[PDB]
Design a protein around this ligand. Structure first.
Ligand SMILES: OC[C@H]1O[C@@H](O)[C@H](O)[C@@H](O)[C@@H]1O
Length: 443
C-alpha cells in the first residue's frame, strides 16, 4: 500500500541464536560453552532452566524452516555454535558440527531462505574462558581461526556473514555487570573484553576473506540504544552522553576508524585498554554492512552514586511497556538517521527487533499478541520513514522466530513470533507472525 512498500529485493527474515534454541548440548561432539557453565550454576537463571533442550532445534530445525516458509520469509538469521565446530575453543575441528550446519544451509537454500550466519552469539567455549576468555588476546586469535574454518566449509553457499552479535552484551553484561556468562563483575575486565572482541572481529574479517572461496558480504551486529537526556540540565545531558558512549560509540567509533571515543577513554582512565595503533587498524577491517539490533531507548538521568557510566533510566509512564521493556518506535528512526548522517557504515540491516510479552495460548488455540503486532507495525513504519530519508536499509529480521531460552531470564520470557511449548516442543504461529506474513506477502 501507499508509503508501505519496501524494495522488491529487501531481505525479510526472523532471527535466532544457537544456545537459545538448539539443545542437544552434548550431542555429536559439542563441547562445553560458558553458557552451559553459567546456566548450570545455581541462581544465575531466574527460573532454574538451562539451554540443555531449549527448542530442540538441533534436531527440529526442519520444523523451524517450516515456520519460516509459512511466514513467507526469504531469509533466516541464525548463529553457528563455536562449541560444535572447535569443541575445545582452540583445538581440533569437529567435522560432525560443520556437517550439521552444511545440511542446514542446504535445507534453507532448498526452501528459498537465504542464510545470514552469525559466527559468535555468546557461546564461548569454556576452555577458552578457563584461560581468561575475552580477557585474553589469544581468544581473538583463535576466534579468527574458527571463522576461517567455518567459511571454508560454508562460504561457497553463504554470502552474508556477521562476526559478532552485540559485543557490548558479551563484554559488559558478561564481564562487568555479571548478569550474563561468564558472570564476572569488573569494569577493567569488561573493557579489556570489549577490546579483544573488537580485535577478534577484525582478525576474523581478514581471515574470512582469505579463506572464502567467493567474495563475501561481512558485517558485525551491534545493539544500539538511542539515548535522550531526561531534562536539558548539564548533569542529565552529560549522563546521556556517557551512556551513549558506553553502549554505542565505544564500538561504532573504533569500527569507523575513529579510535575509541576520547571522552570515554578519559572517563574510564586506566581501566580502559591501551589501544595501540596496530590493533585499531585491525579493528577497522573494512565491512560490507552493519547490523543494527534495536529494542528500546534510554531516557537518562544523572546517577552520580551509581556504577559507571553514572546514568539511570527514567521511565516515561506515558509510553507503554512490554513484559520487560519500554516501547519507543521512534528511537529506531533516530538511530538510523544518526547512522546515515554521522557514520560511514552502509548498507544497514535491522538484524533483531522484537518484544517480550506474557504470551498465552487462548481458548481458540491462537496467541493474541496484539501489542507485538503493533510493535512490528510501528517499527516498520519508522523504517519506511528512514528509507524515505535516504537510509540504505536492505533488510529486516524479526526477533525471534520462536520463543526460546532467554539467557538469564530462562524460558520465562517469550520473544517469539511463534510460541514454543517447551514441554512438547510444539511451535504455533502467534497472531503477530500472521500479520508479518501478510504484510510481507503484500510486497
Ligand atoms: O533482550 C534483547 C536480547 O534478546 C535476546 O533474546 C537476544 O539473544 C539478544 O541478542 C538481545 O540482546
Amino acid at each position: 500500500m501507499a508509503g508501505e512498500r519496501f524494495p522488491a529485493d529487501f531481505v525479510w527474515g526472523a532471527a535466532t541464536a544457537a544456545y537459545q534454541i538448539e539443545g542437544a548440548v552434548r550431542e555429536d561432539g559439542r563441547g562445553v560453552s560458558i553458557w552451559d557453565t553459567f546456566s548450570h550454576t545455581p541462581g544465575k537463571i531466574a527460573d532454574g532452566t538451562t539451554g540443555d533442550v531449549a527448542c530442540d532445534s538441533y534436531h527440529r530445525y526442519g520444523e523451524d524452516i517450516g515456520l519460516l516458509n509459512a511466514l513467507g520469509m526469504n531469509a533466516y538469521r541464525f548463529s553457528i555454535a563455536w562449541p560444535r565446530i572447535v569443541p575445545l575453543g582452540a583445538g581440533p575441528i569437529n567435522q560432525a558440527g560443520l556437517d550439521h550446519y552444511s545440511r542446514m544451509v542446504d535445507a534453507l537454500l532448498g526452501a528459498g531462505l537465504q542464510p545470514f550466519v552469525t559466527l559468535y552469539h555468546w557461546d564461548l567455549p569454556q576452555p577458552l574462558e578457563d584461560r581468561l576468555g575475552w580477557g585474553s588476546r589469544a581468544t581473538a586469535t583463535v576466534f579468527a581461526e574458527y571463522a576461517d574454518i567455518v567459511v571454508r566449509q560454508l562460504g561457497d553457499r553463504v554470502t552474508h556473514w556477521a562476526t559478532l552479535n552485540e559485543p557490548w552484551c558479551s563484554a559488559m553484561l558478561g564481564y562487568y555487570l555479571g548478569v550474563h556468562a561468564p558472570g564476572h563483575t569488573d569494569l577493567k575486565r569488561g573493557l579489556e573484553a570489549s577490546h579483544n572482541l573488537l580485535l577478534g572481529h577484525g582478525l576474523a574479517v581478514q581471515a574470512m576473506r582469505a579463506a572464502a572461496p567467493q567474495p563475501l558480504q561481512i558485517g558485525i551486529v551491534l545493539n544500539l540504544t538511542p539515548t535522550y537526556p531526561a531534562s536539558d540540565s548539564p548533569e542529565d545531558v552529560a549522563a546521556a552522553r556517557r551512556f551513549d558512549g558506553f553502549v554505542n560509540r565505544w564500538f561504532l567509533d573504533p569500527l569507523a576508524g575513529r579510535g575509541y571515543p576520547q571522552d570515554m577513554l578519559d572517563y574510564y582512565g586506566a581501566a580502559a585498554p591501551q589501544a595501540n595503533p596496530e590493533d585499531l587498524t585491525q579493528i577497522a577491517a573494512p565491512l560490507d554492512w552493519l547490523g543494527v539490533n534495536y529494542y528500546e531507548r534510554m531516557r537518562a538521568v544523572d546517577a552520580p552514586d551509581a556504577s559507571l557510566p553514572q546514568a539511570q533510566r527514567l521511565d516515561d509512564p506515558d509510553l507503554p511497556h512490554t513484559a520487560d521493556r519500554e516501547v519507543y518506535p521512534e528511537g529506531l528512526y533516530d538511530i538510523l538517521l544518526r547512522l546515515h548522517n554521522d557514520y560511514p557504515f552502509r548498507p544497514l540491516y535491522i538484524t533483531q527487533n522484537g518484544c517480550a510479552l506474557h504470551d498465552e495460548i487462548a481458548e481458540d488455540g491462537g496467541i493474541h499478541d496484539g501489542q507485538r503486532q503493533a510493535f512490528f507495525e510501528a517499527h516498520l513504519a519508522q523504517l519506511q520513514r528512514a528509507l524515505a530519508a535516504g537510509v540504505p536499509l536492505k533488510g529486516y529480521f524479526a526477533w525471534s522466530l520462536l520463543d526460546n531460552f532467554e539467557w538469564a531470564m530462562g524460558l520465562s520470557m517469550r520473544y517469539g513470533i511463534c510460541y514454543t511449548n517447551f514441554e512438547t516442543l510444539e511451535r504455533r504461529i502467534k497472531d503477530s507472525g500472521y500479520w508479518l506474513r501478510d504484510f510481507i506477502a503484500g510486497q
